[PDB]
Design a binder for this molecule. Structure first.
Ligand code: SAH
Ligand code: NA
Lengths: 265, 265
């Protein structure tokens, strides 16, 4: 009679850890949410088939407002699993659900899975050099979010790389592309004019990490802003000062202009 | 003709993903390295039994100096797997190994797995608030390194969390304990006196991330410095100012003192 938070990983149903699969297979009830991220290489059927259990999908409202009414009650008399894309506690507010479980007398366990936060390593940028992260959110009505622009500025001044999670509106099947994120950032630049994000800014795009052939591209905004990086999900990265081997990787593996091999120490 | 970089995950042999396991089983040759880290919850034998292939272990020198003479030759006429703890390419020098593959006319693919960079989300600390990461190294001889102290300073100064990796002697199987890390930092604080790490500093200790029963403890240095966090490996985190939700999780899940709800928020 416990609750398991089990990550499903980056791209398809095979990105779940063996540990997660074995445990998921032996749970009495299986719940899941697919609004915090997008697993572009799988479907509900494939996941249900792999786990061998019927999966009840919950909405953001079901979770944020009724987790303790839909999931926890069952976690008292049975073993329950709650599945999520990537790692369940990364760039989500799911950690708080563990507090709800405790207060309801339910013990919980977390089974990790590969996350986009560490998968950034495939870009060649040293992961320890990443600074504060941020999310490029879709403007809504007259409200136009811009704090993420300041994060980049803060990190850049320190020579640190900036990881930019991109917005997602699962109910509308909307997945922000790196292209759209670049557009929004250029608009904020005109606004603030801090010289933080312009056509000459070097950026890195990682799309569909977890698949065997993810799209990894590096170059100047003026050149990538209109490039096609394939289907979502995408993440955008604004590197800080580059190490020679980081630049070499971006050129050799990500197709960056050979000129970035020259670093301005 | 193909080299697969496969992550083994966090703690035991089941932390590898289903994708990683199936691919490894289809490879003609399987190599592994355990100098960047060492699965404390398993053994070479258990990993070997799980994959069903003999696993040739490579030293740091085998990889860094001879990757192209040991692994790549076989990758030309067979499918080869290179196993590493955590997520492949997180370790700073691994990314360039892909450049070596390319240079040798060998295609490479990356199979991700849980990394400590994302697993620390289990501490309840928001992932986006983490800043630059660092490693606490043992002083020795006339060398007393202290850069990790400066990292904590720059991060905390901006309200960001600092993820600290603790020194490890893979060969001698010696792990630096969180307790030892604190002592070193207090000693560095006495040296630099910047008001960065003192007895009143709040810290979080994560041990055996990945296992079903990890150790998650949060508190002030004066109380945790002599606490027993169990067997390695230990990860230390110096949080920046907390979001009430982070503090609540640390209190309810990591046994942190109520005091953080008013002092560190
Ligand atoms: N496979 C993938 N490839 C590229 N970006 C990804 C991705 N998975 C997640 N993301 C990025 O992260 C956002 C979701 S944020 C939630 C992240 C998740 N808990 C994890 O551990 O990965 C997406 O909108 C996208 O910008
Ligand atoms: Na980081």
């Amino acid at each position: 009679m416990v609750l398991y938070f089990i990550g499903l990983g980056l791209y398809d149903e095979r990105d779940i850890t063996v540990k997660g699969l074995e445990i998921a297979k032996k749970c009495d009830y299986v719940f899941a949410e697919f609004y915090t991220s997008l697993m572009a290489g799988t479907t509900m059927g494939r996941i249900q088939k792999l786990i061998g259990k019927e999966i009840r999908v919950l909405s953001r409202e079901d979770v944020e407002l009724n987790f303790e009414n839909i999931v926890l009650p069952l976690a008292k008399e049975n073993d329950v699993a709650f599945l999520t894309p990537g790692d369940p506690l990364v760039a989500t507010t799911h950690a708080e659900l563990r507090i709800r479980a405790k207060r309801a007398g339910v013990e919980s366990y977390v089974i990790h899975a590969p996350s986009i936060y560490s998968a950034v390593g495939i870009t060649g940028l040293h992961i320890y050099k990443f600074g504060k992260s941020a999310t490029v959110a879709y403007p809504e009505g007259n409200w136009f979010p811009t704090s993420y622009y300041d994060v980049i500025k803060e990190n850049a001044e320190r020579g640190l790389h900036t990881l930019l999670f991109l917005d997602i509106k699962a109910e509308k099947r909307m997945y922000m592309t790196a292209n759209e994120a670049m557009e929004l950032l250029l608009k904020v630049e005109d606004m603030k004019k801090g010289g933080v994000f312009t056509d000459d800014t070097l950026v890195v795009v990682l799309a569909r990490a977890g698949s065997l052939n993810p799209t990894i591209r590096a170059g100047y905004v003026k050149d990538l802003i209109r490039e096609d990086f394939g289907d979502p999900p995408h993440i955008l990265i604004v590197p800080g000062k580059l190490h020679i081997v980081e630049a070499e990787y971006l050129v050799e593996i990500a197709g960056a202009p050979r000129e970035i091999l020259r670093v301005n120490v």
